[PDB]
């Protein structure tokens, strides 16, 4: 759960971006504190993102699961790969 719950919390308080493009931007801008990935990756993106996330020294989390789950969890309802948590605060365990 943690990752989910922490994050669940993260959406709720936090700022995050879902949306790949966005993610990237976010990452770029640094405004992603953390990037989290689903297992549902078109791998390249994993890597791509990885370079960035790493570039940004951003957490990669492989949140180990799935498109839907990912959506569901973020309080959304469409097939989801990836998120970058820009800022949450209070989900500090996400910042852990």
């Amino acid at each position: 759960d943690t990752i989910n719950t922490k994050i669940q919390l993260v959406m709720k308080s936090g700022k995050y971006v879902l949306g790949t493009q966005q993610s990237l931007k976010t990452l770029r801008q640094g405004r992603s504190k953390l990037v989290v990935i689903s297992a549902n990756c078109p791998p390249i993106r994993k890597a791509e993102i990885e370079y960035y996330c790493t570039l940004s020294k951003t957490p990669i989390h492989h949140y180990s699961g799935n498109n839907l789950d990912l959506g569901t969890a973020c309080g959304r309802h469409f097939r989801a790969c990836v998120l970058s948590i820009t800022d949450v605060g209070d989900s500090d365990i996400t910042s852990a």
Binding site: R28, Q29, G30, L55, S56
Partner: protein
């Protein structure tokens, strides 16, 4: 964030198919003046032609090139590299105005410059094809 001059990046589109560029100057943001964040880049269009052997009479100095160009370029359009060819000697004081002629002028120098780093220097890497 982590994009700064000298840093190498590879260009995608627009006459720069997978081509290598250095950040010269970042434009961290869109304005109306560029509705998109866009960095300013110095970059090379033209890789050189081969060193080997004894290669020709005079000799093949013909082949010995590097055609730069400078371009402002969507943030959305390069793959940045960890590498870096610092814009130190280069630019930190000697900026490139743009403009126009100034874009041209600097580029000329830059050609040479690039050739300096090139002329035997490090990161040979930088100045070449990736075999796609």
């Amino acid at each position: 964030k982590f994009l700064k001059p000298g840093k190498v990046v590879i260009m995608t589109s627009g006459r720069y198919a997978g081509k290598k560029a250095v950040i010269v100057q970042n434009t961290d943001t869109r304005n109306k003046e560029r509705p998109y964040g866009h960095s300013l880049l110095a970059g090379i269009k033209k890789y050189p032609r081969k060193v080997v052997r004894g290669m020709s009479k005079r000799s093949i100095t013909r082949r010995s090139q590097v055609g730069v160009f400078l371009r402002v370029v969507n943030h959305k359009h390069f793959l940045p590299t960890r590498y870096n060819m610092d814009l130190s000697r280069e630019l930190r004081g000697r900026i490139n105005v743009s403009d126009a002629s100034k874009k041209a002028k600097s580029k000329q120098l830059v050609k040479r410059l690039f050739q300096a780093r090139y002329n035997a220097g490090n990161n040979r890497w930088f100045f070449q094809r990736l075999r796609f």
